[PDB]
């Protein structure tokens, strides 16, 4: 048993017709102090998977090293390490899910909520969630922390069920993700304006976007608000 | 205090009440009477926290005796039981509630019927053919459900109570030093001096 010290907030993600999008801001909070402003919380694994991690950053850096070690280990005595026997999103997730549940069962959890976004060998979209309790679930839209309360409602208006995924383009999906990140910046007291976004498409592969900013923000109406009533 | 029983038969109500007063690790008295006569044809047995039991019983007694003098009339057992319940129902939301459970055994001279009322310290009233407070009921209700007959005579009822005392003396851990038995009927209240 511990308490999280340096923390990362919401990770948001959704499926679209040809793949998955995942996003997470670049903040490492220290209680109410917005301490570290250059923390990457999306960690790519090969060219077909991105692991988005929220919660304790020290435990995130440990998980980052496990995934780095997993790639190394997979390559050992593996002539098809960059082909048929490359790491799948499903393999990476199941490994993490095992570790998370093992750690919670020893009463010494990795204090994180994780979303593994990727595309499988057969081109199928992979999107699944796991947390410090080892609880796992999949959905057309997945979000952690505040994202679950604010992002999911907005992303579910785009992809409400499985049949909406083939109808959703990468432009519509990315637009919805970027809007959700703005809404979280308005309303989450532990969010930053700066974020990273990753697209894993079955055609165009992994597109990793860094140093994105929340823009087109509405504040002008604030000038008209005077007093707390009278 | 510990065990108080009540049984309503054909023509009378019988109250049995333990004679043992135990404070701490010592049994101070083995001849205690845990009852007060509220009116000539109404008896109330009581058990609960020390001091509160007697203080409450005597307070009720005084109030009913005051009513009797003012109206030159005896209240029905139902009326007395309703007065007692209201006092306990008032008491439970007081600064320091009365921690007292009572049985009210009365003979209604108007209806020519015995009546037994069981009231706990919360002010929970029920009219019963037979009742108990505390752990007494756990042992005795199985015997009473099995052997109780509404047309039973007082002597038959007295014998039935004897079975209940023996079961309690066998299976209860605490030595309650036997019971004082009192009968309430049309002729008033009398104590069975040999039990």
């Amino acid at each position: 048993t511990q308490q999280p010290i340096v923390t990362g907030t919401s990770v948001i993600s959704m499926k679209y017709d040809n793949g998955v999008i995942i996003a997470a801001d670049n903040l490492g909070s220290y209680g109410s102090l917005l301490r570290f402003n250059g923390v990457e919380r999306l960690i790519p694994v090969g060219d077909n998977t991105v692991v988005g991690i929220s919660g304790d950053i020290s435990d995130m850096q440990h998980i980052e090293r496990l995934l780095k070690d997993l790639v190394t280990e997979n390559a050992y005595d593996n002539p098809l390490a960059d082909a048929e026997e490359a790491l799948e999103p499903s393999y990476i997730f199941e490994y993490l899910a095992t570790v998370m549940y093992q750690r919670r069962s020893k009463m010494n959890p990795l204090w994180n909520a994780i979303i593994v976004a990727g595309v499988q060998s057969n081109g199928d979209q992979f999107l699944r969630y796991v947390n410090l309790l080892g609880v796992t679930y999949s959905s057309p839209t997945l979000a952690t922390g505040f994202g679950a309360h604010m992002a999911n409602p907005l992303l579910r208006k785009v992809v409400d069920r499985e049949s909406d995924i083939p109808k959703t383009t990468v432009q519509v999906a990315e637009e919805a993700i970027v809007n959700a990140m703005r809404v979280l910046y308005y309303r989450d007291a532990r969010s930053s304006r700066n974020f990273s976004l990753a697209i894993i498409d079955k055609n165009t592969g992994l597109t990793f976007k860094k140093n994105l900013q929340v823009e087109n923000m509405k504040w002008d109406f604030a000038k008209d608000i005077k007093g707390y009533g009278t | 205090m510990d065990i108080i029983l009540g049984i309503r038969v054909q023509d009378s109500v019988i109250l049995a009440s333990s004679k043992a007063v135990t404070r701490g690790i010592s049994v101070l008295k083995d001849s205690d009477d845990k009852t007060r006569q509220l009116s000539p044809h109404t008896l109330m047995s009581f058990a609960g926290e020390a001091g509160d039991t007697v203080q409450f019983a005597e307070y009720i007694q005084a109030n009913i005796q005051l009513y009797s003098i003012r109206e030159d009339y005896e209240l029905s057992p139902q009326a007395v039981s309703s007065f007692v319940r209201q006092e306990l129902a008032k008491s439970i939301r007081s600064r320091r509630p009365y921690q007292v459970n009572v049985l009210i055994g009365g003979y209604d001279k108007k209806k020519n019927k015995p009546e037994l009322y069981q009231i706990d310290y919360l002010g929970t009233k029920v009219e019963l053919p037979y009742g108990a407070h505390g752990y007494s009921g756990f042992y005795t209700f199985s015997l009473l459900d099995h052997h109780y007959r509404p047309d039973m005579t007082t002597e038959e009822g007295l014998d039935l109570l004897k079975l209940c005392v023996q079961e309690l003396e066998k299976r209860m851990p605490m030595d309650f030093k036997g019971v004082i038995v009192k009968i309430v009927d049309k002729d008033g209240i009398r104590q069975v001096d040999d039990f």
Partner: protein, 212 residues
């Protein structure tokens, strides 16, 4: 949970209820609280359902291994003590079982052992175990004799559970009867309390407080 067992000239009578609860919720009215270890060994179950089921079935495995190794039926004393010694190892861990081990052997005759998760092991003639034990004790103690007929003893056991099923809120469902003799136990049927109550009330003239 209400369960009992008593010794008389006819043999041993074992009567249990069939109700299991989780809080005020009634989980099941179909629960079996008697465990058939072998033809002459019966185990009652009270407290934790898991703890009783798991360990009393395990006891049956230990009793089978004994008679494989010793070419002889295990004594009720030995069988009861295997269970009491086991639960004593787990003392403090939070095991919640109160059981009766009822059996008949040549050397012992009819024997009942009260075994307890606190490590208590008592031999005796009458035992009532569970939330409704006090209600069952009332009927038993007033009607028990050594000179009962197998028929009358079976009824007393059935009636004592019914008494508890009525009053104890955490006891009820149905009554399972067993009769243990020199030639083993004999099951005497599942008796629904919903039908048994009205039947006993009418025939016996008891329960005059209820209206039917």
């Amino acid at each position: 949970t209400t369960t009992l067992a008593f010794r008389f000239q006819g043999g041993i009578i074992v009567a249990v209820d069939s109700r299991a609860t989780a809080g005020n919720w009634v989980a099941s009215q179909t629960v079996k609280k008697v465990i058939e270890i072998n033809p002459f060994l019966l185990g009652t179950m009270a407290g934790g359902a898991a703890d009783c089921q798991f360990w009393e079935t395990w006891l049956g495995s230990q009793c089978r291994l004994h008679e494989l190794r010793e070419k002889e039926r295990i004594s009720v004393a030995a069988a009861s003590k295997i269970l009491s010694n086991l639960v004593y190892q787990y003392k403090g861990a939070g095991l919640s079982m109160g059981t009766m081990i009822c059996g008949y052997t040549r050397k012992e005759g009819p024997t009942i052992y009260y075994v307890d998760s606190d490590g208590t092991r008592l031999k005796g003639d009458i035992f009532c175990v569970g939330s409704g034990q006090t209600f069952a004790y009332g009927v038993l103690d007033s009607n028990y004799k050594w000179d009962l007929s197998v028929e009358d003893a079976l009824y007393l056991g059935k009636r004592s559970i019914l008494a508890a099923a009525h009053r104890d809120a955490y006891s009820g469902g149905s009554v399972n009867l067993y009769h243990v003799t020199e030639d083993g136990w004999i099951y005497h049927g599942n008796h629904d309390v919903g039908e048994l109550f009205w039947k006993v009330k009418e025939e016996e003239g008891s329960f005059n407080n209820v209206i039917g």
